[PDB]
Design a protein around this nucleic acid. Structure first.
Lengths: 149, 64, 114
RNA sequence: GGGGAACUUGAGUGCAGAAGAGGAGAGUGGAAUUCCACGUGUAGCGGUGAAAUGCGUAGAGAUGUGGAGGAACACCAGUGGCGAAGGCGACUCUCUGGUCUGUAACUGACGCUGAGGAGCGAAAGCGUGGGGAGCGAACAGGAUUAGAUACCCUGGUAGUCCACGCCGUAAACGAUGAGUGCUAAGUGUUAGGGGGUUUCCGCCCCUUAGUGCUGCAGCUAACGCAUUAAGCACUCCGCCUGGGGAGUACGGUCGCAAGACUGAAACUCAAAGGAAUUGACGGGGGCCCGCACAAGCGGUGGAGCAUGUGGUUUAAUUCGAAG
């Protein structure tokens, strides 16, 4: 066995910012192609309308808000199944936070997908959202069991 | 490896001589073992006899 | 109340912390159970570390600066709390490894696997 | 074999040293555990894989003092030493046993073994009188479990200790009886003695007696033992003759008792066993692998239907397949 990894959804190499990185590539982890690259790219403009600024900035601001920095896994010891706090790798951070946004977007429930997702992006740009809610529950769980190393 | 008593050629302890007993007990009051004092096996038992006698006589502490 | 002595027991289940005066007069104390650890978690070094700074906080407001610590029994809390003291801003002048070591004492309890 | 006269190597005595938890009696001392009173002292302490019983606001635990007691003597401590064996470790003293070394002054075979007999003989156990800190059968409570009369936790009676008697057993083992002589070495270590350089230290060579570790020949069925023989030999004693039945039954001798020693049989089986060999397996160890597990996706069973199987059903529901 051994470590393994890959990269994809790559934007262009040079003169590339994160905003156009996503405006041409990235994320889209909702299903097959189509119904993504669509039901998206339009979520951003509705929040260009809903906020008087660049609709991208709120995206990674809400992302920063959702990012955890500790979490906890399960280990078998004696007969207790202690919950052991651990850290998060730089890529594990992004994948899991993005995952939380997408799954809660498809859980919350309103008229339709793109307004659902946009409302959560702003509810995570502000620090009152469902995904952020799970973020602080994982966090309080973790440093409530900080003792276990 | 160096054997202090046979090196300096001295006979039995003469327990009153409390000066070298400090050197042969640790600062904690623990009596040092052969592995560190390097003294001869026959003399070590009469050593611990002498230290025990003087310890009872309160010339060396039981614990420091 | 400038100088004192901090005593900590390092057991396999708990770690108590208590401070006293050179005249052997207590001021304040703390413990893993005092803080809220109930199970085996009391034995963790973290619990003793927490105990250390609550003891320090109960110490400062009475105005004691210099300490020297006596540790009793073997346990994981040996290293945690002692450096937690200086992490709490205090100054511990000596470390004393005083534990009851009987020459023969009393016959210990039976074995754990019979 | 008997008798007489020698002799000294065997066996002892004397002489000079050496060592030792060798034994019995008296006293003495240090760290602790517990309890008690006292100061300070807030909220839990204790405990296990988690927990719980327990102890605490009637102030615990913790922490600083002072007492009270009973048990064992930390490091020194070492496959070290002593003892015939059980066993024997703090210190001092009183009494007392045995051993080794060098001698050559003494006696001159005074030696070995030993059925019965006698005495010792760990721990538990018993009797009398004390003592009782801790530990702790029994016993209670709390856990675990389907159950748990246990493993775990909190208590805790008898015992554990002392004086005098009794029992006479242990895997009382080196699972190897005692004594004597001979048979390659190497290597530690304990108590000595002699010598070569110094009567300095410490360097080495011989040398007895122990006490380990490797290793020839030899023995061994294999392991392995191998000058501390399980080798080569001689004396004396004890013990064995297939496994159960059974160290039980009966009868005796002991014991207050528990029980101990002596110790059949009928019946029944063709095996029971020792050591080594190869696989298997372990809630054994050391490595390594696999969508094996983690880390993700989407599913199965909840509904309807398609199909296969079990059951039932028939006249037949053709037979085969069954982790």
């Amino acid at each position: 066995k051994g470590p393994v990894a890959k990269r994809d959804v790559l934007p262009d190499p040079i003169y590339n910012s994160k905003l156009v990185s996503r405006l041409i590539n990235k994320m889209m982890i909702d299903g097959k192609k189509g119904k993504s690259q669509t039901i998206l790219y339009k979520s951003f403009d509705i929040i260009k309308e809903r906020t008087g600024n660049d609709a991208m900035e709120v995206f990674e601001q809400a992302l920063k808000n959702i990012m955890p920095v500790l979490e906890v896994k399960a280990r078998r010891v004696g007969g207790a199944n202690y919950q052991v706090p651990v850290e998060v790798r730089p890529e594990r951070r992004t994948t899991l936070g993005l995952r939380w946004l997408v799954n809660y977007a498809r859980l919350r429930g309103e008229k339709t997908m793109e307004e659902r997702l946009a409302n959560e992006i702003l509810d995570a740009a502000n620090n009152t959202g469902a995904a952020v809610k799970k973020r602080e529950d994982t966090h309080k769980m973790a440093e409530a069991n900080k003792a276990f190393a | 490896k160096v054997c202090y008593f046979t090196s300096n050629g001295i006979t039995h302890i003469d327990y009153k001589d409390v000066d070298l007993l400090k050197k042969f007990v640790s600062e904690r009051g623990k009596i040092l073992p052969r592995r560190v004092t390097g003294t001869n096996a026959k003399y070590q038992r009469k050593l611990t006899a002498a230290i025990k006698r003087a310890r009872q006589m309160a010339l060396l502490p039981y614990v420091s | 109340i400038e100088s004192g002595i901090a005593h900590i027991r390092s057991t396999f289940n708990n770690t108590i912390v208590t401070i006293t005066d050179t005249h052997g007069n207590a001021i304040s104390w703390s413990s893993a159970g005092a803080l809220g650890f109930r199970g085996s978690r009391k034995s963790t070094p973290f619990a003793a570390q927490m105990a250390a700074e609550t003891a320090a906080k109960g110490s400062i407001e009475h105005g004691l600066k210099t300490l020297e610590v006596t540790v009793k029994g073997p346990g994981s809390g040996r290293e945690a709390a002692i450096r937690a003291l200086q992490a709490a801003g205090l100054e511990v002048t000596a470390i004393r490894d005083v534990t009851p070591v009987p020459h023969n004492g009393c016959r210990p309890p039976k074995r754990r696997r019979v």
